[PDB]
Amino acid sequence: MNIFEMLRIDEGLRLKIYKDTEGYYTIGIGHLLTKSPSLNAAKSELDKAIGRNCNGVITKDEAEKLFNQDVDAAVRGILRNAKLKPVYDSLDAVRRCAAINQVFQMGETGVAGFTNSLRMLQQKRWDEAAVNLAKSRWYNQTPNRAKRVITTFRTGTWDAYK
Numbered sequence: 001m002n003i004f005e006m007l008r009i010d011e012g013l014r015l016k017i018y019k020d021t022e023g024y025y026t027i028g029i030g031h032l033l034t035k036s037p038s039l040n041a042a043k044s045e046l047d048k049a050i051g052r053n054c055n056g057v058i059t060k061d062e063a064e065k066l067f068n069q070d071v072d073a074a075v076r077g078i079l080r081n082a083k084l085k086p087v088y089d090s091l092d093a094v095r096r097c098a099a100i101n102q103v104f105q106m107g108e109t110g111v112a113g114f115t116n117s118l119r120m121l122q123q124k125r126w127d128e129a130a131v132n133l134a135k136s137r138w139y140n141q142t143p144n145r146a147k148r149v150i151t152t153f154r155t156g157t158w159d160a161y162k
């Protein structure tokens, strides 16, 4: 297991524009196109991202290319964030993957309310962190995925992904 295999499990792979769990137009491996309800605005973003007129459809190679870009930008983002970087750098490689996964799903603004979980993770209070992480909109809206990510934070193993 690694961050790519992990996010591939959590995000799936779809080659035609679809709506994610939040009802937002998305493609590939969880590549968010826009929060706009206009399918045409979504198609424009797609074409912009890929560099050709896609008419709502991409190839597996194209999906994987966006995925590489999206994972890279998630990591680089964490590193640029004064609140996130010290916690990230305190973690082992497996728990780092959990962090990338959560940021990928929620965004940096997404995790602004996780100050208390972040502190417990920095302290390596793993069970307490895991309890605190689940007290969230995130957990309630996507519990199956959040359970896997939280188990990864709790244990530093890949047990939840097999």
Ligand SMILES: Cc1cccc(CN=[N+]=[N-])c1
Pocket: 078, 084, 085, 087, 088, 098, 099, 100, 102, 103, 111, 114, 117, 118, 121
């Ligand atoms: C950068 C980073 C480190 C640890 C956890 C998370 C996800 N949000 N929380 N808690 C992000």
